[PDB]
């Protein structure tokens, strides 16, 4: 087909309401891979971290997956637009594009 | 024209370039309703910001957004930053360029952060962050001596030499009014006195402000303590209690002269000084000890100077004379540092274009300034 | 031999130095008759100091001498000393030294008055004063740890390394068991059942004392209160009459960890502690957290301990195991401290003696002892 | 048998003359307790030697008897040293003879002092003082070579050919282990870690000692720092917090060789070497280049062997190899080369005695040796 990469769940699209909380998650297959989440091209998530936005990091022992998630939460309008998610490990390099959408 | 504003702890400076004093000083603090309220047509309005707070206090918890020269929280910051232009400037970012102040020895993350917030957050076509040292030397008229910086938030210690920079000469303490006031708060508890609350907690701030002073000499104001007569004085709170104070009042200023009172192994405020220099070449030590420049926030209370210029001299040898320069609205000269700064010709090209920070991105801010 | 006492609010302990126990415990009130009474032949008797109180409550109003750790009153305070060292003792304090225990960031005037009333009320040779915290501390025999004092007046945080203290890592807190009591009261109006009186006062305290445990989690238990057969219980008052509590009992003891339902911005008991090792330096902090010791009267009930370990674990770093030490008997281990202290021989020449007293004046407490 | 004792900034390395490891190493420390501890039974103490410091660290205030090779302070030197021979050794000064080893192009005052000490303070047959540079040459059992001393308290060059040492090429550099630590501490505050107190600044010594590293080539790793993926490494404190650092890391060693950094004017550790080679005669200059010699505390660090060779090579001509020699155990060559030296059969010959020391004086000790 075409490789397969890191993820073996791809982030997934998503429609959120102003106020409301939106989840987005990727998992990769078994030292611990990095996920980077951003916003655009160069804008790192990681350095929007406050009330609006957290990451939670998650291992699971009876299945090697590694789950990361992106939390959004009292998502304002600003927010709306195109997000890329990007995991590294040692032997692989990994990225998937997914949008985000605020209605009101 | 361009905007300067100035934030170190516990107030915000801000106005515009060219111009003598800022439009609006009020103290940097975010409060929210702690307690529910009861009733039909409130605005709810889930935060204040500013002085605002001040009035609403009691019922308010109140959050500063900076310490010690750190932003705790970055969204409290841009609700400041969003009332001090929008609610007592009435102006737009888009129109005029804005210079931010910074602390010596502060870390990379806050500088990129705050660039990256006035980009985006709020569009401005330019910016430009400058150190807290330098600016205050600038409203002095003078390009060589040493700054010591001292405010709500962290004091700092920048000798100058004609235009240069010693980044191993600059010394950070950990030091401050806000530090002045938790050991003040405890000191009153001791008296019969108690204040365990944040919004009381202002109060005897506004009691070190004005009542405080420095000691010529501790053990000697001290010892005539035991004839209280000219070393109590009564301060009246909004409650309507009368507070009176003696010996008490003059050693919290101390504190910053005698760091074991605090409990930290670091060294008072005129050793700090010596550190600096003795760091810097022998050709220039000399001037330096004669171009002392008092400035920020907690250096207002009186005595200072006098007890600096003692303390100084006598670990200093005797072979130079020792000169203090702590001139009038010391408070306000980092701000005015700011407006002179940006009002030189040369200083416009130097601001950095939001057109520059768009491609190469945050990190820009250090490679391009000090 | 000598003579140990420890007044804390509500109650008095006090016995001979070198006991496993104090001779006589008892509460500490004092209580006049409000109501005249019509007869002939009746004592007058116009205070009851004690338990003798207790039996006569009804008629009597009850006050309590020491608030917050400060006492209001300070003749009601003379007659309980006096009530303890005649009525109970059966001692002469002429024979034997007197010790007395402090709480801390305690008022100047307390400790300094406090002597005065020791030497010229009561004749003794010396005396001495005491931190509460430092004594718990030894009836655990431990040389290292935190020291989580609360008591029916105030709670009390004091970390100890290796015998050294700390003073600006020392946090008062203004939660108390006899705070804990009027929210108790406040909380059993909304069931059906009111308390306005001081005498019945006493018997919700009763009712807290035995009754009232710390939930392990406070939203699961509440969670768990809709359906209730083993939350409610039937507590029996002198009246006759029955009364049932159902969640309103375990939630009490939660306010000390939730400060917000009293209303003060104050962190609650596990923060606080977490502020103290903050304070402290990072190489004496790995120590601290696990070796948290409970002491004092609002310790007693079941639950504390496990619920401090898990807030304490989950702010704190997973990097270190925390424990804490909770023992049986720690309500008198104040007291035991005090014994074990005097008995110890290099302490009896510490002792503030009744000659140095007389040219030097009361003054001397700060300047000897902490 | 014989005792030899190394001091030099920071760690005390002492042992038995004729055995290849010394018995006892410990930190060059004194601290003193700057918090008043209140307890009864505490053994006071009023100073800690050694690894006793380390232990109760937080509490006390450390300061090193050494600095830039110079003994700030007698009295605590005489106390490590009664640590050294009593606490460890478990022997007397009486019994056995002492080596002691200097500093190059040191002041003469502390090697007359030093001596006066050891003959008066411990009563000694005989003791003699040598230059560190040659003792490490001994350890290596190379006649002829050029030896870079670096240590915790200054780094010293000495260039030896047959056993004859050439007084001009001496050179002695101000850069050291403790001056890098400063660099350290100043640092890890841009990233957003503070340290301003002694007792956590030995914490980042000890990261320095084995996290930090020396690149081979500073400006690619600087280059790839971007993708921080195995230059950043996580470390543990006492404390229980988690520290992670990046490219910080391996510039800090960089400073040795690019003094620009820490603001000074004085080239770096590869020039200097230089130097001495400059200054020497033509004659010997070829096995010099080839017979380089690594030694003391702050060589430990992995990458210099390889980083010094590429530099030393791209500057000095192509038309002879440069071979440096920098063995495993570096840190300890100087006692070993101590050791070594009692036990040669000229050397007792050649013994500052207690004899000789009272007719002559203190000053017979440049006069005796070099």
Known sequence: DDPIGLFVMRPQDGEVTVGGSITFSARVAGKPPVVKWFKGKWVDLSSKVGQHLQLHDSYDRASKVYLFELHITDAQPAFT????????????????????TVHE | AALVIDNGSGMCKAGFAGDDAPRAVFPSIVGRPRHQGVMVGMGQKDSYVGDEAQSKRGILTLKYPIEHGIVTNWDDMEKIWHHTFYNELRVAPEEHPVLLTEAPLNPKANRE???????????????????????????????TGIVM???????????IYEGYALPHAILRLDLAGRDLTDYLMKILTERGYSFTTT?????????????????????????????????????????????????????????????????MESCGIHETTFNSIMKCDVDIRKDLYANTVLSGGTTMYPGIADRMQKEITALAPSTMKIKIIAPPERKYSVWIGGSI????STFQQ???????YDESGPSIVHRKCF
């Open chain 1, 81 to 100: 637009g195109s997000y890329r998610c990007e995991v590294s490990t040692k032997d692989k390099f990994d990225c998937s594009n997914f949008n985000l």
């Open chain 2, 113 to 143: 952060k705050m660039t990256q917030i006035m980009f985006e957050t709020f569009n401005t076509p330019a910016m430009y962050v400058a150190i807290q040292a330098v600016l205050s030397l600038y409203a002095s008229g003078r390009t």
């Open chain 2, 149 to 159: 910086d001292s405010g709500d938030g962290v004091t700092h210690t920048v000798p």
């Open chain 2, 199 to 263: 919004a009381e907690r202002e109060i005897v701030r506004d009691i070190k402000e004005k009542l405080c002073y420095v000691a010529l000499d501790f053990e000697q104001e001290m010892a005539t303590a035991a004839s209280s007569s000219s070393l109590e004085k009564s301060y009246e709170l909004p409650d309507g209690q009368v507070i009176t104070i003696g010996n008490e009042r003059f050693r919290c200023p101390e504190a910053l002269f005698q760091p074991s009172f605090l409990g």
């Open chain 2, 341 to 344: 700064l940006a009002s030189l």
């Open chain 2, 350 to 356: 130097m601001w950095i274009s939001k057109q520059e």
